[PDB]
Nucleic acid binder design. Sequence first.
RNA 1: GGUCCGGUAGUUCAGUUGGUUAGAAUGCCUGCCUGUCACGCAGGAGGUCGCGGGUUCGAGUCCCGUCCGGACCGCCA
RNA 2: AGGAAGAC
RNA 3: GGUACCUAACCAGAAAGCCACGGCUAACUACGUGCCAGCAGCCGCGGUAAUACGUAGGUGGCAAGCGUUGUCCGGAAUUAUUGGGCGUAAAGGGCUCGCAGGCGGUUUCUUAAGUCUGAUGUGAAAGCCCCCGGCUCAACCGGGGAGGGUCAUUGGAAACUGGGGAACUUGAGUGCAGAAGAGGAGAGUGGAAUUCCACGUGUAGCGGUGAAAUGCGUAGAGAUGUGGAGGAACACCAGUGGCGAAGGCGACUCUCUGGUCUGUAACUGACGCUGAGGAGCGAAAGCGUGGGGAGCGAACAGGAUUAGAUACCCUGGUAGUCCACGCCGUAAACGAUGAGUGCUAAGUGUUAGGGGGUUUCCGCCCCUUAGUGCUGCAGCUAACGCAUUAAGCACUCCGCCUGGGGAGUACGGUCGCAAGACUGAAACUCAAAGGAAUUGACGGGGGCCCGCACAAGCGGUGGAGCAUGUGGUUUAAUUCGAAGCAACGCGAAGAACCUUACCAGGUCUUGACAUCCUCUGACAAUCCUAGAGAUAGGACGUCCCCUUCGGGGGCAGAGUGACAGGUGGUGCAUGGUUGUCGUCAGCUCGUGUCGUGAGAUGUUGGGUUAAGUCCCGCAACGAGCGCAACCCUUGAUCUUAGUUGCCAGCAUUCAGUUGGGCACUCUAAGGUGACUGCCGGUGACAAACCGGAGGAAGGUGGGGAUGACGUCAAAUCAUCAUGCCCCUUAUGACCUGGGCUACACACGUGCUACAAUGGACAGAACAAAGGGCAGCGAAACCGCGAGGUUAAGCCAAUCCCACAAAUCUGUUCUCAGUUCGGAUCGCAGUCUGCAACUCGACUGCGUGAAGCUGGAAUCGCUAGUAAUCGCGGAUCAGCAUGCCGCG
Length: 206
Amino acid sequence: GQKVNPVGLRIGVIRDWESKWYAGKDYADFLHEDLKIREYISKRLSDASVSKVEIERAANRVNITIHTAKPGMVIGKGGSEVEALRKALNSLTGKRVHINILEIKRADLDAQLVADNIARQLENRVSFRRAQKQQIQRTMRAGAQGVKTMVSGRLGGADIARSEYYSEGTVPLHTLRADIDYATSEADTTYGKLGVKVWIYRGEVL
RNA sequence: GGUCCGGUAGUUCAGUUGGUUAGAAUGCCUGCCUGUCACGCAGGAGGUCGCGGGUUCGAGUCCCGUCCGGACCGCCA
RNA sequence: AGGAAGAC
RNA sequence: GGUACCUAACCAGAAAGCCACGGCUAACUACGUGCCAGCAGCCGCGGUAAUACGUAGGUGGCAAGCGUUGUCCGGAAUUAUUGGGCGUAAAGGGCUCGCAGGCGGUUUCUUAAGUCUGAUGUGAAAGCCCCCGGCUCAACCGGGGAGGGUCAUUGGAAACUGGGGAACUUGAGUGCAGAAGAGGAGAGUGGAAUUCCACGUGUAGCGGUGAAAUGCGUAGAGAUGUGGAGGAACACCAGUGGCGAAGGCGACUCUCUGGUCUGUAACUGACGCUGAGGAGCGAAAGCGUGGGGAGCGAACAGGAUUAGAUACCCUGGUAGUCCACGCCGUAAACGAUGAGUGCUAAGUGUUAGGGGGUUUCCGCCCCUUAGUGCUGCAGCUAACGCAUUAAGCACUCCGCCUGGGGAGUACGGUCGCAAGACUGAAACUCAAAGGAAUUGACGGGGGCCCGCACAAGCGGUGGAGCAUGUGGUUUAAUUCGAAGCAACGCGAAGAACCUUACCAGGUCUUGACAUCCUCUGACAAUCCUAGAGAUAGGACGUCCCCUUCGGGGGCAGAGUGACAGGUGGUGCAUGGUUGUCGUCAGCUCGUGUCGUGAGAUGUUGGGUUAAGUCCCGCAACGAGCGCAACCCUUGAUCUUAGUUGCCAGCAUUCAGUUGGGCACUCUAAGGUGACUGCCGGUGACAAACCGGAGGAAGGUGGGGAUGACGUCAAAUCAUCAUGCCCCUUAUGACCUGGGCUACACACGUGCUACAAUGGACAGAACAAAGGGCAGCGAAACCGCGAGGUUAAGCCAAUCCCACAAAUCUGUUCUCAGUUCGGAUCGCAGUCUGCAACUCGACUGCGUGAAGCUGGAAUCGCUAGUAAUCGCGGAUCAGCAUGCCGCG
């Protein structure tokens, strides 16, 4: 009884996939293994706040590129992450891996980082309203064309669970050539479990 | 204490008169309508006649003994 | 100026 | 009384509690309890996360005290002179005449009762206050002043209120000249209708309501033309017009009579206003006595309607309504606005006058009163609203209110023939009852508009058999969840055993599931005893890599505690998803105006659209989510791209397979294209609507995807997750068998039919979209059959599923429980699987059931749509009537 997920509605027609390959008659166990890579990358790089990973097959070699938007607390001495990730990933999948990193300039317009920012202030236990206003101000001072933010759950009141919305600019969810970046994040506090949905209208596609 | 009428579906009354084959409402059950109940509308139901004897076209309609009701009389010094 | 219709 | 004080000699040691901590009201956190125990001065708190209950800690107020109770004053402007009100909140007497009472126009003299101001005597002393002194200020004790007086005598002032004398005319009356009136009481007269009676004509119905019926009528009704009787009320004139103090007063004439208004200036000269008690009127209904009684008509009766209907509706109909004489004395007796007087912008009608400008002509204008309206400033109000006919600004007098019930009640009085009228408590109980406005919802309220909503049709549902779900019921369990639309072929896109959670049986304690401590450093499989499960022991039977000989690379096992697991409860502890209203067209914000405020405006109004879609006025101007477009697919063509298609144009063969070539269908990239693009008529020329043309389609071409703010505490703890509960020598685990599929019943959804718009048999057909390597499986052979055999081809525009049926031509049946229909039942099989009894599908037989198109009601359907006919696909070893998709 809600809107259909906009990234899942945009993929295939305007949005290119995050995976660019084919597997025949071994499709199932490649999906199982590369989701094991994606959960392991998420679990060990949640501190480094990856926006997205994207993979490809190189005829029994796999190429991984990871979008993290900062080298600073991520690359270490420069080779530490690539040795500690490439040997570990070789140990897990048993196949030849290659890894590369990419950065996002104007780094406050990426939705997964925005929802992780909101979630991080929720375990930081600053007030949710201050989190919404500060993130709205951060996204407009970075510059954008529209932001809609939602946080639902038990927001400090024990006996009621209600959502809060905060928006600015235009976010049409029904124009197809619109390039909404959408993100859902999950926050665990002593009050309970809180859901964040942020979706950003960055630009236009002709 | 005598006299006269009745004892029928869960309830109230026809069939007691018309010796053959047991009926009408109400109530009960199922379905329909309405969000639900009530109304309302479609179908469905048991009774052998207070208890025992007899006899015939054939005993529920005939009579007797008992029980339960209703009515009348139970007077004269 | 052209039907009676209850209750939660 | 050796008491306070003065000198001293030693000890921080003997000496602090009460209340509160949600808001008022300064001061908060955890644990128990979980509509129980309890708190509470009011709001109210507690039905598993209690800042409101009890603890524990801490804080806050006060302090030798601190709280509760009781009483009084405040805040209470909440009995209001200071200091309230009465249109709608509680509150204007029903209205008049007036006694006592309360107020009084101007001027001029006069007294000093009221008024103001000195003098004297008094209002004792302690008390309050002002200024000083003493006990170690202090509490207190003193010394000197201020008064708590409408106080008594007396002096002074005369403005105002009073007492007196004399003027004045505006307030108020009288006269004189005019005007209007449904003002009242009595007597009389008139016409139209209704009823009743008599007669003439006249046939068969009249009346009545949403249909109806009771009633009246062949003993002559109703209609119709006459003539009498009697009662009531006076059509049009008739007017938000007139008159009256109020109630009220409408036919006309007469007798008597009450007022009102205009003008004058001839008079009297403050005669005035209000009015407690008192007296008098006073709608309708009611009562007593005597009349009258046409119509209407409580009561009452019959007829309906309804579940009942003592009611609305129909037919009758007594008291009453009418007159005279009395009584009662009430109304939403209303302007829900007491009477009187005076000031304060205007506009416009109407009633009765007066005066002026060329008229004694018609009318035209300007003053002018006294009504009677309607708009509308300042001003008032809480808004509505009032506004020279105040609810404005004042002055006098009167009446009345002080929260809602109980109550206009009980008691007690005065009236009354009576019913009742006037006056009118309390005990007790609640924390609200209200007034006016705003936002929604709703209406058997209105106005436009839309949708298979109803209407027009087609085909079904219950009716029969069967399949699959739900409730009930029994069992060892029939695992749970869902419950009107929006649960019930739903989660399940597949239960023989695992699935499986549920039941029975026999078995486990760091367990298969994640990491630390220590070894062996590689573990297992093959056959037995029980074996069905763990287990216990046996035959080879705990068997890698780096290795400065130290040790590591986490796979396998072994013993240990921290442990892990919960498809267990809580969707009303939650995120995450979903349906619904609903593809309905709406939902809001910024800035600014209007409003005391809630709010309003934009977002309403007009014209069209499917739309809050577009445009024109507008205290609005804009913006955002929605709508429409962009996306996908189906609809024609150009270029490129021709194999694993096309065989056109050619030669070849039954396999048209081939030798050769892309123009066509075909697969598909870029496009071309349809967008209000032209004409006419409407529409103020705008936006839009209708009819026309190359066109494949004209007015979003068809369909999909797309589902706003929110509602239903809607559904899911069954993917994951703090919150509690039991375990961890067990609700957690292993397996065997059972159950989820039972069955007197009722329902939801579907399938198959009841047939000759057919059945059976025989022959010719037309070929969409998907799936295929632990597979799809062609040919051929065997088989009265599902199937079996070796098996060519295919990792797919080639090979297989793929043999499409309904369709078209022949014979039969001839209307039947049949050559329909196929369900149950026995026999014999095929396939899958360790295993088809509980509980799979399919085939050959035989058996042939109910059913002859289905009541109340009820469902879907508008340019391939319903209906039929098949075909694939998904979960899966096997199982379709379920679901998805295609023709």
